[PDB]
Design a protein around this ligand. Structure first.
Ligand code: SAM
Length: 259
């Protein structure tokens, strides 16, 4: 049994109160109030982000974990935070996002932030049945949380295969969401993939304690087992002490105008 599995079991054990306190205990988050109001009022300008993903991607890009450039593909773009953020980047030439949409799934949000004319968000698309196309920047943010470690593992495996098909055309720069990296077979296959392709695993502090997600990014050089187990250690530790306060970071402003 790995530390992440113990984390998972302990998480399932927790009460509603304890969970409510734990999910955000000590994490970093973004004040999305004004962005929510503006977006609800139909303000396409102002530079507001459509989701929190922008803040996540930002956190990585401003640390060299990846450097977006050229043709960008956003797999499971949802509302499209990653797509717009990437579209605000100089080296980036084209952004193509794809999400599932429909009931229960996010639809893209039409906003005119900076570089909105180079964005192209396509809903009603299941990337598992989609043919890969050559690109320079491979983004993927797929991985739905489940109470079952086995389910999360299987979902992660399917995702990793699907993105394997895309990485085979060989970017470049890439950011791939890994929901469940805390099981043995997962660390094994992630080691394997980290041999075949490059990159490493990074735990974004914007991620809530309720999820063990780490992002497999290109510009990172790390050991799988070590990074994962340290992440597990942290998420475990936050389940014992008092409630650590949240570090309220500022929301990202993507400005306006075209490119
Ligand atoms: C966690 S959200 C991330 C959204 C985006 N990264 C952002 O920053 O706003 C993942 C989205 O991917 C979509 N999705 C999940 N599986 C998909 C699939 N197989 N094909 C296309 N989209 C999918 C879901 O609808 C979900 O809204």
């Amino acid at each position: 049994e790995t530390l992440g599995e113990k984390w998972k079991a302990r998480l399932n054990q927790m009460s509603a109160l304890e969970f409510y306190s734990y999910k955000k205990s000590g994490i970093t988050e973004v004040c999305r109030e004004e962005a929510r109001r503006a977006l609800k009022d139909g303000v396409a300008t102002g530079g507001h982000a459509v989701s929190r993903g922008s803040a996540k991607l930002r956190w990585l890009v401003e640390r060299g974990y990846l450097q977006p450039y050229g043709k960008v593909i956003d797999l499971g773009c949802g509302r499209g935070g990653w797509s717009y953020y990437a579209a605000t980047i100089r080296k980036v030439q084209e952004v193509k996002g794809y999400t599932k949409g429909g009931p229960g799934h996010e639809e893209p949000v039409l906003v005119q932030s900076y570089g909105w004319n180079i964005v192209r968000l396509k809903s009603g698309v299941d990337v598992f049945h989609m043919a890969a196309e050559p690109c320079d920047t491979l983004l993927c943010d797929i991985g739905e949380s489940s109470s079952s470690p086995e389910v999360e593992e299987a979902r992660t495996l399917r995702v990793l295969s699907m993105v394997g098909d895309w990485l085979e055309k060989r970017p470049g720069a890439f950011c791939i969401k890994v929901l469940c990296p805390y099981t043995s077979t997962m660390m094994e296959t992630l080691e394997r993939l980290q041999r075949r392709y490059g990159g490493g695993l990074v735990r974004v502090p914007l991620s809530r304690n309720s999820t063990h997600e780490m992002y497999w990014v290109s510009g990172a050089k790390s050991n799988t087992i070590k990074s994962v187990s340290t992440t597990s250690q942290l998420l475990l530790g936050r389940m014992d002490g008092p409630r650590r306060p949240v570090k309220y970071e500022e929301d990202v402003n993507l400005g306006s105008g075209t490119r």
